[PDB]
From Swiss-Prot:
The chain holds residues 41 to 213 of 435 of the full protein. Residues 11-173 bind DNA. It is found in: Nucleus. This is T-box transcription factor T. It is linked to Neural tube defects: Congenital malformations of the central nervous system and adjacent structures related to defective neural tube closure during the first trimester of pregnancy. Failure of neural tube closure can occur at any level of the embryonic axis. Common NTD forms include anencephaly, myelomeningocele and spina bifida, which result from the failure of fusion in the cranial and spinal region of the neural tube. NTDs have a multifactorial etiology encompassing both genetic and environmental components. The lineage of its organism: Eukaryota, Metazoa, Chordata, Craniata, Vertebrata. Monomer.
Length: 173
């Protein structure tokens, strides 16, 4: 049976319990922690592509005041994000199951869109969404999934100082 598990789920939870933040800049910043998944249960001989996009967890604008994240009261419809393709796509199931599938190269921006960069709306909450699509045979969506531990708020600068401490501790950047 299909099984797609989040690697380093405990560190992701460490960030989630404080409300995770990801820096968005004009040219882009890589995510931390890195989105990595362990995959099993695919057809080892079928052809698949791994895609990544970002879905807004809600339509509100968030702000960090008095040490707490709070939403606004004037939500807006959100535009669909650009779709990032894993550089190993397309590939066989045996390749995707051999080792963790890492999305370390994607860069989150507030402007530049495409070629590895994905533009997000600042101060909005997002979930990364992984898509496994079968490319051969009858092409079909195998799965589309968001891991709740990977939820984050896009920021132009870190607001929670505990988040800054965590990023410095576990990411050399
Ligand atoms: C975004 C660049 C971009 O998104 N390029 C791109 C997207 C797709 C795509 O939407 N694939 C897809 C979506 C949903 C789904 F269910 C399936 Cl099966 C496939 C395909 C190909 C692409 O580029 C080649 C920035 N741009 C400026 C909007």
């Amino acid at each position: 049976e299909l099984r797609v598990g989040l690697e380093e789920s405990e560190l992701w939870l460490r960030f989630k319990e404080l409300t995770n933040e990801m820096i968005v800049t004009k040219n882009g910043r890589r995510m931390f922690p890195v989105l990595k998944v362990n995959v099993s249960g695919l057809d080892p001989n079928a052809m698949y592509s791994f895609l990544l996009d970002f879905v807004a967890a809600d339509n509100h604008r968030w702000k960090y005041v008095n040490g707490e994240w709070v939403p606004g009261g004037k939500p807006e419809p959100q535009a669909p994000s650009c779709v990032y393709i894993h550089p190993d796509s397309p590939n066989f199931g045996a390749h995707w199951m051999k080792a963790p599938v890492s999305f370390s190269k994607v860069k989150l921006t507030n402007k530049l869109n495409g070629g590895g960069q994905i533009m997000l709306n600042s101060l909005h909450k997002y979930e990364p969404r992984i898509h496994i699509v079968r490319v051969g045979d009858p092409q079909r969506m195998i799965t589309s999934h968001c891991f709740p531990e990977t939820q984050f708020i896009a920021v132009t600068a870190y607001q929670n100082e505990e988040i800054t401490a965590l990023k410095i501790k576990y990411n050399p950047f």
